[PDB]
Amino acid sequence: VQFEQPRRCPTRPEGQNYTEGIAVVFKENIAPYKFKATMYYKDVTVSQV
Amino acid sequence: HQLSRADVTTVSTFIDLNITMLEDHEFVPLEVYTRHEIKDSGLLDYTE
Ligand code: NA
């Protein structure tokens, strides 16, 4: 018999390359559009007594 | 003559193993829509 010769050792992974950057994450808009209005009307009351 | 151990070339019989601890991480609260946003998405509020 002979002894097994040294095995090929594994290699450490290269490591994930990361791009740095700035981000803005947008979501679907569910808020209603809001604005200001003015109602002009007249309450008309006819009372039969 | 006389030498210190720093004056002798040093070879290592040790196999290196560099283990580092997984760091602490903080999870902030995060919501896509708040319950106020969900309430406000209705066109007409009956109560108001
Ligand atoms: Na051998």
Swiss-Prot record, chain A:
Glycosylated residues, chain numbering: 17
Domain of life: Viruses
Compartments reported by the entry: Virion membrane; Host cell membrane; Host endosome membrane; Host Golgi apparatus membrane
Physiological role: Envelope glycoprotein that forms spikes at the surface of virion envelope. Essential for the initial attachment to heparan sulfate moieties of the host cell surface proteoglycans. Involved in fusion of viral and cellular membranes leading to virus entry into the host cell. Following initial binding to its host receptors, membrane fusion is mediated by the fusion machinery composed at least of gB and the heterodimer gH/gL. May be involved in the fusion between the virion envelope and the outer nuclear membrane during virion egress.
Family: Belongs to the herpesviridae glycoprotein B family.
Subunit structure: Homotrimer; disulfide-linked. Binds to heparan sulfate proteoglycans. Interacts with gH/gL heterodimer.
Name this polypeptide is given: Envelope glycoprotein B
The species this protein was found in: Human herpesvirus 2 (strain HG52) (HHV-2)
Lineage of source species: Viruses, Duplodnaviria, Heunggongvirae, Peploviricota, Herviviricetes
Gene: gB
Residues of the whole record sequence present: 120 to 168 of 904
